[PDB]
Design an enzyme around this catalytic site. Structure first.
Site, PDB file in Angstrom:
ATOM      1  N   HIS A  46       0.789  -1.240   0.000  1.00 28.28           N
ATOM      2  CA  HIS A  46       0.000   0.000   0.000  1.00 28.28           C
ATOM      3  C   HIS A  46       0.818   1.286   0.000  1.00 28.28           C
ATOM      4  O   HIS A  46       0.262   2.381   0.060  1.00 28.28           O
ATOM      5  CB  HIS A  46      -1.009   0.045   1.166  1.00 28.28           C
ATOM      6  N   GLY A 196       3.100   6.838   8.533  1.00 28.07           N
ATOM      7  CA  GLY A 196       4.461   7.157   8.146  1.00 28.07           C
ATOM      8  C   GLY A 196       5.330   5.957   8.476  1.00 28.07           C
ATOM      9  O   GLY A 196       6.408   5.774   7.911  1.00 28.07           O
TER      10      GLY A 196
END
Ligand code: 303
Length: 245
Positions: A46, A196
């Site tokens: 992803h 992140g």
């Protein structure tokens, strides 16, 4: 990372910093990765599904800060970006969220092991640490859910593995969490991975040797009550990694 401690790459020799070039020239951070072997990095699908061009990525090893070139680092390029052929993304859960990036330097060589650039061992068939085991996670991800900027220095933290039945309770993830995924979290919900950090390492000390058991994938929020972080269960995908490397 939410909470945790600030650390330096020497402690995380196998952590890879993955970046991406933009039209014009700016370069932003994207996701983390783990050094499998000198020529391969494994992360999550992803982090590249939208811009599937091997050419737009940069992979750093031995780098301790976001905007600094730490002593002894190596800059790489993606020779081959292989994505699991059955990936899908639902409201929360992400399926077959594993990826392989065959790295290569401008001179044509792979990574060169040192005191700051190492590799972790893949788990072995059907051997996963029991529930309640402590493991570490690493990333240049948010330190708060309300921040838009990432910490200029690498961070780390420890969490505990949650059983599968416990992760499927109504107040957790119901049937959304599947047997090919693992759940981990702080029993006090104060520390956790966050946006992140995806694609980064979840290292568990299994029977003596530090093992790469999970890959950061998804989770409802960051450090929220009864909302653990879900990881990709590497052990399940061994036949895929092997035949694909
Ligand atoms: C910009 C963004 C929407 C991006 N677009 C491409 C597709 C895509 C898919 C998933 C994600 N993932 C996340 O933003 C994301 C966000 C929060 C996360 C939180 C945890 C955790 N609580 N441990 C663990 C993993 C997490 C991943 C981002 C994107």
């Amino acid at each position: 990372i939410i909470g945790g401690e600030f650390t330096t790459i020497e402690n995380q020799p196998w952590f890879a910093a993955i970046y991406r070039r933009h039209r014009g020239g700016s370069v932003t951070y994207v996701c983390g990765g783990s050094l499998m072997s000198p020529c391969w990095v494994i992360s999550a699908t992803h982090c590249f599904i939208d811009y599937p061009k091997k050419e737009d990525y940069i992979v750093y090893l031995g780098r301790s800060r976001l905007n600094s070139n730490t002593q002894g680092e190596m800059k790489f390029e993606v020779e081959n970006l292989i994505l699991h052929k059955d990936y899908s993304a639902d409201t929360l859960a992400h399926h077959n969220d594993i990826a392989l990036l065959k790295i290569r330097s401008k001179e044509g060589r792979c990574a060169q092991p040192s005191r700051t650039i190492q590799t972790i061992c893949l788990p072995s068939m059907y051997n996963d640490p029991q529930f309640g085991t402590s493991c570490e996670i690493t990333g240049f991800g948010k330190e708060n859910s309300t921040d838009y900027l990432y910490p200029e220095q690498l961070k780390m933290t420890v969490v505990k593995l949650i059983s599968h039945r416990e992760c499927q309770q109504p107040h957790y993830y119901g049937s959304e969490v599947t047997t090919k995924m693992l759940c981990a979290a702080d029993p006090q919900w104060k520390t956790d991975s966050c946006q992140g950090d995806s694609g980064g390492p979840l290292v568990c000390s299994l029977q003596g040797r530090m093992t790469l058991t999970g890959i950061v994938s998804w989770g409802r929020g960051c450090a929220l009550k009864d909302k653990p972080g879900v990881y990709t269960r590497v052990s399940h995908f061994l036949p895929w990694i092997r035949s694909h490397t």
